[PDB]
Every structure is written in structure tokens, then in C-alpha cells.
């Protein structure tokens, strides 16, 4: 069993990964291995971490995914880690409370 490419492209680049596959017909057949992307992340300046409620959908299928598959139902849900939201909810509240005090 030696295999050859089936899609018109023939280079071992990262976007052209292939999977060897024994078939029902007992052929051994290369198949395109999907170009998996890492999923949604909290922003790079906030340490760039993978989000919890969100799937690493390729945008090729992200359009067809349910909205909540790419988010949590929290404010900034598809954008920020829960701690990052809570950092703000505190920082919004506490900073305004000092400003409200600087009028006195």
C-alpha cells in the first residue's frame, strides 16, 4: 500500500495535511485532513487564552453553528474570560465609586 494525492494539490504544506484511510473497498486512500483552527480566545493583550464556552469551529462551519456554540450567555460571552468580565464589573464599579467620592 503506497498512497498518492487525490486533490489536485501535491505539497506537504500545513494546509494540505492528509489522512491515510483503509476503505470499505479495502483501498488505502489519502483524505484531506481538516485544517483545524484553534477557537475563540480572549484578546491577546489579556493573555490570549482559549474561551471556555466556545468551540474551535472553522469559519467554514461557524456560519452554520448555533450562536451559543461560539459563546457563553454572559456579557462579553464570546469575547472575555469570566474573570476578565469580572475584572471590569469591579473596575467599572470601583472606579466610578472613587470618582463619585472625588466630588467630596
Partner RNA sequence: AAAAUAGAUGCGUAAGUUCGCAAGAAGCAUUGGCUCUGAGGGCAACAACUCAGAACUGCUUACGGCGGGGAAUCCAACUGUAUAAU
Partner RNA sequence: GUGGAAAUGCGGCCAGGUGACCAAUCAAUCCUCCCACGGUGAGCUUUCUUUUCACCAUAAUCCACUUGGGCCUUUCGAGUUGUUCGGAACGGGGGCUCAAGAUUGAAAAAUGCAGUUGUGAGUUCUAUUAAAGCAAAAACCUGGGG
Would you tell me which residues interact with RNA (CB under 7 A)? 1, 14-15, 17, 19-26, 28, 31, 33, 35-45, 48-59, 62-63, 65-79, 81-83
Q: Within 13 Å, how many C-alpha atoms sit on residue 86's CB side?
A: 3
The site partner of 22 among other proteins, RNA, none (C-beta below 5 to 8 Å per kind) is: RNA
Residue span binding other proteins (CB under 8 A) among the ranges 2-10, 13-21, 62-70, 89-97 = 89-97
* C-beta of 32 vs 82, nearer to other proteins: 82
DSSP character at residue 32 = E
One residue of 22, 27, 47, 65 binding other proteins per CB under 8 A = 47
CA distances for 35 relative to 5, 25, 92, angstroms = 16, 26, 40
- 20 near 29, Cβ under 8 Å? yes
Rg (CA), the chain: 23
* C-beta of 83 vs 96, nearer to RNA: 83
- 38 near 56, Cβ under 8 Å? yes
Site for other proteins, rule CB under 8 A:
46-47, 73-76, 82, 85-94, 97-98
Amino acid at each position: 500500500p503506497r498512497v498518492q494525492y487525490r486533490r489536485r494539490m501535491h505539497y506537504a504544506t500545513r494546509g494540505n495535511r492528509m489522512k491515510l484511510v483503509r476503505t470499505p473497498g479495502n483501498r488505502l486512500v489519502m483524505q484531506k485532513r481538516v485544517k483545524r483552527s484553534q477557537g475563540p480566545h480572549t484578546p491577546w493583550v489579556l493573555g490570549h487564552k482559549r474561551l471556555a464556552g466556545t468551540k474551535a469551529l472553522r469559519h467554514t462551519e461557524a456560519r452554520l453553528a448555533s450562536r451559543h456554540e461560539k459563546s457563553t450567555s454572559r456579557p462579553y460571552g464570546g469575547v472575555l474570560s469570566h474573570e476578565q468580565v469580572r475584572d471590569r464589573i469591579v473596575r467599572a464599579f470601583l472606579i466610578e465609586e472613587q470618582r463619585i467620592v472625588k466630588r467630596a
